[PDB]
Amino acid sequence: NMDVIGERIKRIKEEHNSTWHYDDENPYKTWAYHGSYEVKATGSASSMINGVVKLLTKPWDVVPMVTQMAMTDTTPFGQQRVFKEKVDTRTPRPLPGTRKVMEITAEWLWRTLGRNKRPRLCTREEFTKKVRTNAADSAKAAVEDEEFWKLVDRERELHKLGKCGSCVYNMSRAIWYMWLGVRYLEFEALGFLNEDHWFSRENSYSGVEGEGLHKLGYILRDISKIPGGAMYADDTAGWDTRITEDDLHNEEKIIQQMDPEHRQLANAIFKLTYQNKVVKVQRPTPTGTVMDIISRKDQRGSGQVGTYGLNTFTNMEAQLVRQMEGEGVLTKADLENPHLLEKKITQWLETKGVERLKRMAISGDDCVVKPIDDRFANALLALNDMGKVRKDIPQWQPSKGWHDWQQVPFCSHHFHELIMKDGRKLVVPCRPQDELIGRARISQGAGWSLRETACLGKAYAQMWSLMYFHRRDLRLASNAICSAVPVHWVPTSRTTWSIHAHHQWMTTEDMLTVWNRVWIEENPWMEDKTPVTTWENVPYLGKREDQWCGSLIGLTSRATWAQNIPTAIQQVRSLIGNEEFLDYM
């Protein structure tokens, strides 16, 4: 294994030859440990609190989920506990028959996904444009430096020779240029899956890439119209740690569709940084803090360019395999058989494949499946054998499905169908309210002024007005935040890193105008384009549903907050200063 990773470890070792040592008390059991060096400890035991949101959500000061979210340990201690609890495991190799059906399905799926689209290399100027639009970090400074691109070119030449010198995953500007350079090179070779929307619903059938949270519920409602069994949405326990060497070799098959110069670079990413990887992780010691150098041949590196798309691919494949087992196409005997009949798998894929993909909504490790009947609930042999063991359920207990699409969990949400006062139906996204408030109360970074804090608060408020307006407490808190923050202050930072967020709330445009654009004008499931002219006609969940989903409506403390909210707004305004404010209450 040293022939692939040796050069990276040699460069790390030489850069820290003063403090480099082999810590024999290292806690790694399934990862190869190469050595350690001294570092300055990074992270925090607690997250910073957004005072603007906190002051305008007083009843949630006494809420346990709101307190828990404010914690999250990122210190070397936090890094180590997460590592031990999840990442330091080995997935048993799938059986020979399971490997065979996965290989057949992966070959058919890649050909289906590439039926209209051709892979291509992504560029420096594409990466540059993405970095600029995201910052509008030190990444914008690097991208502007010609020496950054010269470091990139030197690494690419090693990749072209089948070698890697500086692409290290992390759990001086030279080390930062090497990390961003590593990410650019991955973007160059595999970025096309995202940039050219290979996992869009039109291209992939099961996929939802580019859809946006406001479309997911409508897609689940459409799947519910397909004849079949219940809708299943099983969670995998730590999906990224369950990506096997066999999964990685099946994902690598996309390189067969590439032009020769592209194939060479993508083969370098797969073989040197996915199937072999060098990882840095911080660890507390009695003496201080060390950086450990570790390696392994499987699992998925969570913070990589190709992660979302490749997880979506492998999950689509795994769910098709589970549907084949449910239909009796794959038997227990087939999974143990290296010599299983390839023809019946091929025949099912060619005649039923696409129809079975349309029965699913797949976003990375998140899946919703509506099989042809409920035999799927007990079809667990291939799923468990592929390593995709379901979270917090005995291995052989049947999956429980839903017969109502509104009860289905997907991407941390569930979806409600609302009837507007004018008779039109809306399908809206929702999650436990404490989660929404708890997140909005967390600020991103230290040494952030009242201005930056208030602008992030406004970004959360405006996200609530656009996606979660149907929650009484969030509409009231949103109105309060937007009344407390100067009208012309532009929302900053980001409320989420979800691929499903399109950030339409990152504006100073009227939120009702934006609401009409998203929910009426652009909404393909809204035939009648009549605009809503007042928030009074923007619906809420039924009161009982709002309460079931965490609303404090009906509580005295909530009634007191609603009554006295102009006082808290004025208190925020007085600390912000003599600025232009608008009264949204």
Summarize as ranges the residues that interact with ligand 68E (CB under 6 A).
212-214, 411-413, 435, 439, 463, 467, 496, 498, 500-502, 504
Among 113, 164, 190, 382, interactor with Zn ion by CB under 5 A: 164
**Distance in angstroms (rounded) separating the CA atoms of residues 182 and 269:** 9
Q: Which is nearer to ligand 68E, 324 or 463 (CB)?
A: 463
The H-or-E segment that residue 38 falls in is: strand 32-38
Give yes or no for residue 318 binding Zn ion (CB under 5 A).
no
CB 569 within 8 A of CB 480: yes
Sign of CA dihedral 466, 471, 474, 479: positive
Give yes or no for residue 430 binding Zn ion (CB under 5 A).
yes
Total residues contacting Zn ion by CB under 5 A comes to: 4
Contact partner, 167, from ligand 68E, Zn ion, none, Cβ < 5-8 Å per class? Zn ion
Nearest residue to 498 (alpha-carbon basis) of 233, 216, 298, 131: 216
164 is in an annotated binding site: yes
Among 167, 293, 310, 428, interactor with Zn ion by CB under 5 A: 167
The H-or-E segment that residue 35 falls in is: strand 32-38
Q: Measured at CB, which residue is nearest to ligand 68E?
A: 502
> In 114-145, where does DSSP find H-type helix?
124-135, 138-144
Contact partner, 242, from Zn ion, ligand 68E, none, Cβ < 5-8 Å per class? none
- The least CB distance from residue 503 to ligand 68E, in Å, is 6
* Angle made by CA atoms 264, 266, 272, in degrees to the nearest 5: 95
Contact partner, 190, from ligand 68E, Zn ion, none, Cβ < 5-8 Å per class? none
Q: Which is nearer to Zn ion, 161 or 490 (CB)?
A: 161
- The least CB distance from residue 130 to ligand 68E, in Å, is 18
- The least CB distance from residue 341 to ligand 68E, in Å, is 40
CB 204 within 8 A of CB 196: no
Contact partner, 214, from ligand 68E, Zn ion, none, Cβ < 5-8 Å per class? ligand 68E
- The least CB distance from residue 302 to ligand 68E, in Å, is 11
Contact partner, 283, from Zn ion, ligand 68E, none, Cβ < 5-8 Å per class? none
Cβ-count burial 56-88 (b if 16+ within 10 Å, e if not): bbebbeebeebeebbeebebbbbbbeebeeebe
CB 451 within 8 A of CB 489: yes
Contact partner, 571, from Zn ion, ligand 68E, none, Cβ < 5-8 Å per class? none
Q: Which stretch binds Zn ion (CB under 5 A): 123-131, 159-167, 245-253, 439-447?
A: 159-167
DSSP 286: T
209 is in an annotated binding site: no
Please give the span between the terminal C-alpha atoms of the chain, in angstroms, as a whole number.
64
In order of 214, 357, 425, 518, 523, the CA distances from 211 in angstroms are 8, 17, 19, 12, 11
Among 152, 233, 549, 572, interactor with Zn ion by CB under 5 A: 549
- The least CB distance from residue 549 to Zn ion, in Å, is 3
155 is in an annotated binding site: yes
482 is in an annotated binding site: no
430 is in an annotated binding site: yes
Q: Are strands 360-363 and 169-170 parallel, antiparallel or unpaired?
A: unpaired
- The least CB distance from residue 212 to ligand 68E, in Å, is 4
Contact partner, 500, from Zn ion, ligand 68E, none, Cβ < 5-8 Å per class? ligand 68E
- The least CB distance from residue 515 to ligand 68E, in Å, is 12
Q: Which is nearer to ligand 68E, 249 or 502 (CB)?
A: 502
Q: Which is nearer to ligand 68E, 324 or 467 (CB)?
A: 467
Three-state SS letters, 523-562: CCCCCCCCCCCCHHHCCCCCHHHHHHCCCCCCCHHHHHHH
Q: Which is nearer to ligand 68E, 255 or 411 (CB)?
A: 411
The three-class DSSP label of residue 155 is helix
**Distance in angstroms (rounded) separating the CA atoms of residues 47 and 43:** 10
* Residue 202 burial by Cβ neighbours in a 10 Å radius (0-12, 13-18, 19+): exposed
**Distance in angstroms (rounded) separating the CA atoms of residues 189 and 428:** 37
Contact partner, 549, from Zn ion, ligand 68E, none, Cβ < 5-8 Å per class? Zn ion
Give yes or no for residue 12 binding Zn ion (CB under 5 A).
no
Q: Which is nearer to Zn ion, 345 or 430 (CB)?
A: 430
Residue set of the binding site for Zn(2+): 155, 159, 164, 167, 414, 430, 549
Residue set of the binding site: 155, 159, 164, 167, 414, 430, 549
State the residues that interact with Zn ion by CB under 5 A: 164, 167, 430, 549
